[PDB]
User: What shape does this take?
Amino acid sequence: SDKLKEAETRAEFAERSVTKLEKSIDDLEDELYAQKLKYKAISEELDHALNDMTSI
Amino acid sequence: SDKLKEAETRAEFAERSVTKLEKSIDDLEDELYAQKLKYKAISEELDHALNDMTSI
Amino acid sequence: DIHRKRMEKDLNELQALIEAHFENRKKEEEELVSLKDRIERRRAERAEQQRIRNEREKERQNR
Amino acid sequence: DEDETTALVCDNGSGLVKAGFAGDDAPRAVFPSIVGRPRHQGVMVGMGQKDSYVGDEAQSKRGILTLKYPIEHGIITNWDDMEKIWHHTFYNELRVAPEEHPTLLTEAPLNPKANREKMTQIMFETFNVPAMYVAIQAVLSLYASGRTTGIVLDSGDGVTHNVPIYEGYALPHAIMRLDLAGRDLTDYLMKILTERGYSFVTTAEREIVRDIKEKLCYVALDFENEMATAASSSSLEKSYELPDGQVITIGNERFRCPETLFQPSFIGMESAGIHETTYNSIMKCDIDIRKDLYANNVMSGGTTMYPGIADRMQKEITALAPSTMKIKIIAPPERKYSVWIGGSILASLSTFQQMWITKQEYDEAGPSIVHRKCF
Amino acid sequence: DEDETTALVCDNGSGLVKAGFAGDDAPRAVFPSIVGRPRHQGVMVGMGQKDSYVGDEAQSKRGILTLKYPIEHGIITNWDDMEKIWHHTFYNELRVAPEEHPTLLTEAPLNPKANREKMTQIMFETFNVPAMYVAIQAVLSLYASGRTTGIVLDSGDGVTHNVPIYEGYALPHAIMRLDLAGRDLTDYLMKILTERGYSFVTTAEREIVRDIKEKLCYVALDFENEMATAASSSSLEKSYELPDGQVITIGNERFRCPETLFQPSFIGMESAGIHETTYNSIMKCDIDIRKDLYANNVMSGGTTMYPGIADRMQKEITALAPSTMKIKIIAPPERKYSVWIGGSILASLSTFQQMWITKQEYDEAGPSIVHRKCF
Ligand SMILES: Nc1ncnc2c1ncn2[C@@H]1O[C@H](COP(=O)(O)OP(=O)(O)O)[C@@H](O)[C@H]1O
Ligand SMILES: Nc1ncnc2c1ncn2[C@@H]1O[C@H](COP(=O)(O)OP(=O)(O)O)[C@@H](O)[C@H]1O
Ligand SMILES: [Mg+2]
Ligand SMILES: [Mg+2]
Assistant: This one.
């Protein structure tokens, strides 16, 4: 019975850790997304600058 | 004993989930940091070009 | 005599300018395609994690 | 290594070492002349525990190392340091053995003759280079410009040299060395930043502030009027993002730092600005060609990447000299490599191997042979 | 208050505040720069319940107060703290009103110009001083010595400054600030005492150990030989009687604490010992007068009450510099008051009131007028 309460304790520990990690993954992936999109926008603009250079 | 075995199985499942999510977070973390290192580089360099506009 | 040789090498570098552009453009396109596939990867991962959390909830009330 | 026995071209500039092969357009291994040494002693094991750190390794390990300069304003501290850094350059960076390739080296203007004799002797004994030639960086920058007439302003990191050369002829009687260089710039900026509230002494912040000089610094068109309008100057004031992330804002200091070379009285030099040193240099020589010197001035060095030297140069010389003839400066982009380019140019022609300094000449006449073999 | 409208003389030294009247030989109100604040909140009544505690009151109430430093190495935390301590000094300690007496103040060397502009502005608005003058403590210590030639080593509690002045003129190009001071001394001694078995963190023990430094500390003539003979050293080992009554015995640490300024590598500074900082400072300036600098070095600060700085100073400089001319240090007893004495000296002569910074000048040109009125 003591081993069973210890098992339930470790199970709850791991489940709370899982929930925290899942939320962290979601937020990190959203942040990485927005960051990459802004970098893509600047890269777009710079590519347009390269095209203008070629036109010269 | 049967209940202890079921609880231990569930706890091990949860813990393996924990470790796998941690590894995924690690990989994402490295990619985001690099993305940003190069974002700040390209932003600074666009600003440098603007400084060129000032020198002109 | 040496100076004309420099005028020429700079010219070599000048046209090389576009050659420097090419690797940057391929790297840009690689970032392009990686982000575009990351789009659907993120969406599918969100759906998968929603299903996983559903299983978490059912196991939660089951105990 | 190339299949051909082409020569090595190495510019040991006062502040940067740029090495590579002859026939190449740019030096392959380019590194600053800083050298890092373990700040403490050894107790740990499993990794590191190496004395000399050079190149980008020391740049990454700046914080843990005492950063020392094996050369400052031409003066040589420890030949062992040059031995190690040349070993690193030849084998770890150039991946070349000096046994099969003669070396063309460039030296700082008016370097000691005793320095040349000792460095050549230690070189020949320690290394096995087949042949040798060493030249002044002034004629190298001239070769990079490819015009035999002009006055070269070599702005290294230890000394600034003004050297006039007319129709490919050196004029040592009108050559001068000024002790103002990057070191002074960093020092002066350090004291001004101290008056701005930020007081650092270590070399990492030295590199940070020289980077700031590379990025943001101005050369003031009019000095006191620009501080007068820089009182507030929200737009004119400029900021930098230090790698730790703090935003450090600087205003008039941007153009008050390089100004000290032009106005040495700020930190107490009897010599006036470097434009006066070019002016006196010009008049020392015959009157007639002086106009050509005015119209053919060249500037060289890593510092030249900064803006503002050209406009200031011409305006002040026109103020000092009569404004009949038009004065124009020439400065090709990325001219800090130009000296090394000229070294390649020296190896380009087939007459250069007529005066290689071979091993047997040094074995016969000792180092003293260079006194007759170079000049 | 004296019937005459004589000026106020206040030395806000980095570590001690010494204030009094002009024409006096010693400052009347002298207190350390520590400031105590209630460690907890108010529930009791009938006495106390006061926020700011300064001076001997805080010294007596050290245990109950969080002890904070309104200034550290020149950096200013909260101007309100200076407001309160100046109120206390002027009214509770000096029993004087600043309305009728101009103030001569001394500031730490190379203090921020923005710091000067803000402190002067808050001062003028908050207080009603008729006139103002602020000077660097270096020339004040020079005045106390009364000799226009020499290099001043100002060892405050936050910074140690080396400043050369030849024939009464400042040499900012050869002036340096080192971040080693009393704070470092206490820290290093704290870690060594931790290795001796006694580990404290709070400020009361900080004051106890600085008192130990005042009383028992040595400056080792030879370092490693003296720890070698200090292995046992029953006679050489020295003890102190802490106010609680326990006897705390210290041996080599007595001369291993100040040595750290001389040997910064103990706790990791790129800069070498302060003697190297005086040496470099000397050579930066023209060669010829350097001998006079060697023979005219002065040291100032409260730390100077310790023994051993003079012998160490001369021996190491003679080791570094040629031993032809004789080097001798001068240091009058109780020189920590000397700066304030020099302030009185400034008020002694009748030309000093030609450049008092009056209220109307500040009202016209704002704080910016000091940029043109002091320097
Ligand atoms: N890309 C750059 N932009 C601006 N300044 C630079 C750059 N690279 C180097 N420098 C400056 O050039 C100095 C080194 O000068 P250097 O070129 O070695 O002189 P020399 O021409 O005599 O070899 C350094 O102190 C550094 O501040
Ligand atoms: N009577 C004394 N004996 C020894 N050391 C002292 C004495 N009085 C003060 N000090 C030391 O002097 C330091 C304060 O230096 P201070 O005189 O304020 O520098 P400054 O000269 O820049 O004002 C304190 O940290 C203290 O340790
Ligand atoms: Mg140069
Ligand atoms: Mg002091």
Chains A and D do not touch (no CB pair under 8 Å).
